[model samples]
Target: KENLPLITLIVMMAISWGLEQFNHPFGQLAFIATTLVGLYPIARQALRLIKSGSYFAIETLMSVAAIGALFIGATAEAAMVLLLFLIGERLEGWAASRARQGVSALMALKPETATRLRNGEREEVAINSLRPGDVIEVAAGGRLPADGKLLSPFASFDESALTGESIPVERATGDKVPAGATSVDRLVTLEVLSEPGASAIDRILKLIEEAEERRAPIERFIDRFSRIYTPAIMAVALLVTLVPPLLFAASWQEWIYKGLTLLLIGCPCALVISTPAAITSGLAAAARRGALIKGGAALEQLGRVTQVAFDKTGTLTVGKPRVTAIHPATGISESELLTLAAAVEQGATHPLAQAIVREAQVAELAIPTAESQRALVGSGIEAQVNGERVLICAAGKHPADAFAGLINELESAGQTVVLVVRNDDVLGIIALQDTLRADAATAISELNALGVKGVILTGDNPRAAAAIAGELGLEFKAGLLPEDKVKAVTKLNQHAPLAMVGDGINDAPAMKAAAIGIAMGSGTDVALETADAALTHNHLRGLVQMIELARATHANIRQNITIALGLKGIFLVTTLLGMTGLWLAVLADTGATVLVTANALRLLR
Candidate 1:
């Protein structure tokens, strides 16, 4: 249809200057046929949206109204408005598609396969093919494929993506690691503990599916309004024709003309279009700023959220570990012990190990791999290498009788203890901590000012969670496992539906469990893939801005609804009185359209 306009316009211009080739009524006739042909595709489905109760569907209402105007002999006005509206609807759809691109794209990246143990070998297969008791392998940097029990070589994963925990938790054999967690190092095999239908990702997907089934947030009000609007407007148009004849004893022709005017103006154009147009554009504007909203429901929900939950590691603090302090034996110098600890941990893969490893790597120290790496129940890592027995136990894990004094010193400074020993001789203790993200505190404070309470959920110790929570002036729950995270979320929801922010594969369980789950862009693919929505800008500051955007969209939708209802009320009185004129009717219908569009236009940029 659009191409026809452009092409015909060009052809008309060329023929007008050169020859009589395009001058005949045939060109006009062809253009007319083309428009009618175009109408089937658009008009057919348009009738469906209207009949199905998408009341605010501007195109349908406008078309119906235009048809009514045509019935009243207002042909030119009807044709012009209908034509402009077709163009308007196209632009609106494109803008809406842009706004929802993030969620759509996230859904596009669904993981295709899970490793299944068949016979005696592990093989990669589609997620749906596996049955019970199969084992799957997930390694450091791999996403957990399903909800299952961790095989004996128990490992740890970064679950911030789903649960928003900043800490990486240790998973021993027999412990359940839910789907959507990404392993950082070492291979973890899981024994399937649930059917594929019960996987965390599937559950979250179900929530989204249900939301899709619900009428889009803006649709509900529109459909209801349109149902009452049409008949009422018709009554107003009829009254305009009938009333004056009785009250004023006016002539048939004059009275009929007035009624025609009312009929022409009877369609609720402004009200029909206002809400959706604003919503479409507002959604796009937010998307343009790097915040992807799942749909109008979530966008609208954003304005009403009174409580929020932050996963400790990724949302409140920078995820990576950093060296915060050091401890040396009485006989050792600070530099000597520091060098040895950094050296041995140089190439280690553990969370705290990475911090030490990286430090040594940067200092040009040559670190040999620990030959006899072993996991201790309460301690960190025990290793034998470089002709010495070394223990990389947390400062707190050292037998209280052995390192009680050193632990006291480190605890006073809020440092994590990483004890290093070689050949039964205590080498030193290294302190590690997470650096708080620059924008975390700002985001928390603003949410507080906005009357939004904040909470933090983490697998880290209560002391760690409390420390960070106190810094941000929010509530804290520490030492939550995967299931515990879900329970905490349920508790948080008791006060108000919560929005959980995280970026680990494990966070998917909690993310799916929340009213709204926002995964950070910086998190792993598991986080991104499972999240209902995501913030690509990688800062919490955008959260407040997105919230403001959601509120504005809601406000605009209300205005659109109000304008629609108000016009209907006036329409009712006018039709009942039968004093309406044809010109006024045409103005009312098209004018409503123009006004609604003008108001809705403010959101485009």
Candidate 2:
């Protein structure tokens, strides 16, 4: 359908050329027929644009140029002009469709059907019919139909499509697995968490749709320029046509020919499309690699960011606390101290408490039962274990003067110290800390190589934040409140453009204050809502990839602008001097449009 006009025009042009080569008396008539046939679609579109209040559309210019050439006995040039114009439009359409294929590929990830568990029976049903709270079963190696919570004891899922992670992730009971992830190891049952159109993939698709509406500054500037430039070019064409004949007494036919050439050369199709083509392709490229850039403006801003402020806990670190060390008192063994702590924390869900319990489980310790377990509010937890009073509290709450040196050493190394107390005496101290992500250092170094500085803005203690920053060789601003983070971002942004990376509700304000905000895949809903872009793979390396892609898009836009304008400048002057005629002018305009579009599509790779 898109190539119909181009094909028709080409066939008609071929026939007209053949008749003229034979010196047939009907040659002029054939050319006239060809011009009228080729002008049908172009004139239709020109009328549509006029009705919609676009007076200087490219189609309008082409229609005027073609009809004027026909009236001046230049039927061959008039036919050729419309043919080339259709060909250029076809190429631009092809490139745009190719760019949009990425989003279509994303939408294809959803399965057509799902197996629902109803009345103790498995029934195959359409995925759109599945609703939240419905239990569904996926066979081994089958992709999930909707975002859901795992109901089975355990299963490994390959979420490579949603997140770029190649390895299958082990999901436990109650873990929320996104739609399109394949159940890798076993037949897993999950309860749906989202409505039909509210799955993870749908949200990303919606973001892509929204991305198109947010134009970049360059694109907007080009739009504004074209609005005025098109009409100015039309007025110039009028002067070129009348001034030479009326005042200078030049031949009317010769000057009108030049005027028509000017109108075709000044179409503005290439210049207007330069920036958007590159921006669209760049956004698609980023989305394919698991980065959801909000739009062209954010993508453009990302390239200019010179400083990146990262939230320490979730952005740079794993954000999950784990036991790093166990110190036992004179009488207690390491196993004994861990067992006592884990017993009181077995039913707790805090990260530190879970870390202690996990450590004991890994050690294969037999945890004793605790009676009357209760949390000590701000300090810790206490319960009766082994018929003795067991208390676990923060090291600072109790007197740890005897192990003061040991506690200070742990604190300085970025570990949180918790004392195990039996009755009144302290039994031992266990150290836990959130470790850095595997790619944290590499991401920071990559940013540094790009001449972008990294800073850690965290709510953690000064020593802890300092330790993580020192490892990455970055500056740190520790002990910041939520509002303080916003203050830090504002200050840093004053010196240079900044991007804030975070995964917590507290970081939302700071992220909003920065030049651009980036969120991790597993971050809080508020954080994701506030962010300008998100790394769906939850990998720090994606940040570097996004920035590099943005910069490349910026460069590609500049190159396209040069190509679009340079060709027009040369053609405009040549047409005025009569070195180039109607056909050459239209050909140059078409060539420029195709070249700009093809150049922009390179970013999709």
Candidate 3:
């Protein structure tokens, strides 16, 4: 359908050329009719653009040159120019739609209706009609219509559409299943957690819409350049038409033909589209790999980053603490001590507390009931368990003479040690550690390979920070406060462009201070909203992929600009020297436009 106009014009030109073999005058008339038919669309678009305050639009250039050619009795050339212009416009439209498919595919993941479970009866309801707290059921191989918490005991889901992960993720009851994930096993039930148009897919779509509005600096520069360059080129064409005939006594017919040819060469269609085409493709490519770059400026900046500062906890490490060891005092069993600790820490949200509770759960120990549970504030938690006061405090905060050697050993080894005390007598010790992400070292090495240094900015104690940083062989700034992290990022960004990768509210300030801020998709909402880009797959390896894609886009933009301008430069001189005519000049502009667009699409691979 898009190619209809170009195809019609091509057929018309062939008929007109065929007519010329029998009768020149009749063929000239046919050519004029074909040119007029082709010129109407171009002329209407030029007029509309002028009304919209875009006086220097490419359509206007083409319209003017084609009209001038017809007036000078070069009817065949006029028809040829319009045909080539239409072809170029169609090609550009195709390339743009191809770039947009990535975003459209995301939008298409949402199912139109959902099975709402209400009053013990299954009802089919529109997705938009569903609300938060609504229970919905998804059969195997079905995509989720909204973000929700799983109600089924356990189910596996394919989240490749959203996170680019191919394997099915096993999720238990109460686990969050984002919209667009397909249930892989038996029928599952979930309570909808988001309102209409507010699903995870919607947020990503909104980001893409926002991305289009924020143009790259190079795109902006070209826009400003074309605004002035177009009018200047038109003025030059006018000079070429008038000055030679008036000053050098050259023939008016010859000079006007050269001037019209110059107008076609200076269309600016290719140059105007050079930057944005590559940027759109780059952003689409990144999204396909589960890296959501907020805008073209961030994408362009990522290409030039000299260093990346990673937040210690969630960004570099797994962020979840696991029980490493459980040491029971002489009088109590390990299971008994774990149960008492788990009872006191059950309701606590701290990572270490959760680790203790999880350990007890894994051991299948029955947690004793606790009364008067309370936090010790900056220390640990205190509660009454089994008629005895259980105080779970940091080893350094409380003196444990018998366990001092054990505490020092664990702390030095980057394990966090907490003491469980009952009625002033130590019960046992629980050791937990948050280990580095499996791919963190590989990601850091990849960054180094690209000449971008990786540095760790952590709020953790020096020993813990060093333990992870040493393993990755990166520079470290440990024991920093949130404000201190910001200061460190500012200092690092002063020497070179820096990207701060983080996953918590504390890391948001430091992220803001860097040249570019990146967040883990599983991070706090504040961090996700604050960052310029997000790794939706929650993998550090995506960081390397994003940088490589950015650099490719950066190089692609440069190549596109060269292709657009180099062709125009050659055609400019040739047209003025009469080596190329109106048809060839238009072909040059059209060819350059197609070449640049095709070059930009290479990033999608």
Candidate 4:
């Protein structure tokens, strides 16, 4: 729309100037009133942009310049400044409204219908028409239109669009089919699992959107600047009008014009737009990388994080088990000890124990069955398996000294070691290890570079936690009870706001106590619901990027705020001395706005 309040403004200025020729009361009213109306569009547009999480650019600078002219009682100059500012704003708004086409790129992947083969009959229909027990046919390179079950033995698919996982996955019979992934290998058939709307791809998109909405950060300085800056400027405008006449003996007519100029140039739009715009843009970038920053509040909290608490199983290590180290007393064979140890761990609650049990079952060994098992809280597990006394726990308790050297070695390697003992004799130790995320150490190092200190606290044995701390180059406290973990965080509050990373029902209390709680399990119902942030990957390495993004956004906000405020200070000082006029105000305000915008836009990439 080429609606720039131009003709109306000119008519008002003409009426005002003509009235001045006749000395009519309407001269000041016509000029001052119409100029403000003309400035409205540009001022509102800049305000709206900032409120919606984007900074005002050239528009902000222009508004300030227009007000500066009115501050000096230059009605004609003020009217022109407002007219130009509105023209610029209308063009920008038009450009943005047309940019709706950019959203289509995201929608291009939406699947419509699929071809299903039922009882040797080929039929094409909407994805919603398929149902359970129906076999859906998927050809190579075609998207899986809806949730379905595989009838063919294998169907490999590229699920990156949904999971961000680089590797293609193989689906066999009984596997749930997700919508959107394209078949990558040979043609395969699948049975429908659900209607089109509830597919895995849909879930992924919904989750991402929901996470982003939940983490909207707070604006750093926009609120304060708006609340105080505008009123302060209003007071100064009053002073410029009255003070010049009473104290400096300037003509009342001239002072009235000067007061109006002050009003025209002193709007706080630029300062108000700065922080929020940068935050919104930064949040958009973070979401693309699979992170959702809640809002400005979270960003501020992140700035205060001085120490990090991590849950051992899913946060620091792979959460997948592997043989760490094995040790047997002088006469006992390592293999023999492992075979027995595996049997005792078959029903254990700890993740490592379950992994060992699963490994033994895969080997098809005849492990002794343990009946009437008893678990010693925080220490070990005991049971009467085939009438033999068995205790599975940390080796530090019994003939545990036999494993001292090996445990020490594993601890240094960042491995979680579970011990096996029988009849007061340490049989051997099974060190279950998780592969650390490849980027974890480097990520932690980056965090330190940002001045965010990292700390690790876990309920795991001392050796296990110590080993992980060494590898990641963070500090730690091991063997803490659930409550102790909370206390540790409480104590850490003295240093800075704390962040706890964990997974497990036991961690609920500790997580609640920390300033920010991040859950490492994406699929766990409790963790997903309770933690402030969820690392769906199970690899805590993502936290490294999260911290980096928060810091960058925070820095951008500060940069914009400084510019907006600095511009105001300069304009106020210059305008008071009668050194700045309409054009300079327009250039400074709009130019500063453009600078903040360009800076904010960089975050989208």
Q: In candidate 3, what residue range of length 10 has the lowest lDDT sum?
A: 102-111
Q: Which regions of candidate 4 deviate over 4 angstroms? A: 1-219, 224-235, 250-257, 260-264, 318-321, 328-354, 357-429, 433-438, 461-463, 470-472, 478-483, 504-515, 521-530, 562-591
What are the Cα lDDT values of the candidates?
0.64, 0.75, 0.75, 0.62
TM-score of 3: 0.58
Q: Provide the lDDT at 574 for model 2.
A: 73
- Model 2 bad stretches (over 4 Å): 1-264, 331-333, 363-372, 376-378, 566-589
lDDT, candidate 1, 1-605, per-residue tens? 23455344334333433432556555444434433443444567767876876543544555555555554545434444444445545555555455456555544365568887768887888877766688777766777778878875657787655555545777777887777767866777788876878887666555444433542244344445556666666667678778888889888667677766655454444554565666676777677777886655566666667778778776668777787776677788656666666545654577778887766666666665556666554436766666777777665555545566767766654567777777655677777777788888888788777777877778776666766777778877777765666678767776786777876654656666666778777755656655656888578877777777777777777775566546655655764577464444424455455556666556545
By lDDT, rank the candidates, best first: 3, 2, 1, 4
Give me the displacement of residue 161 in model 2, in angstroms. Answer: 29
Q: How many residue pairs clash in each candidate?
A: 35, 0, 0, 37
Task: Give the local distance difference test score of model 1.
Answer: 0.64
Please report the TM-score between candidate 2 and the true structure: 0.60
lDDT of 3 by residue, 9-115 (tens): 78888999998999888888889989999899889988997897777665666687677777677777657657655665555455445433422332223237899
lDDT of 2 at 536: 73
lDDT per residue for candidate 4 within 192-271, as digits (tens), equals 87765677655544443443344434443444344455556666777888988898799988877777656655543443
Give the total clashing residue pairs for model 4: 37
| lDDT: worst 10-residue window of model 1 | 210-219
Q: Which model scores highest in TM-score?
A: 1
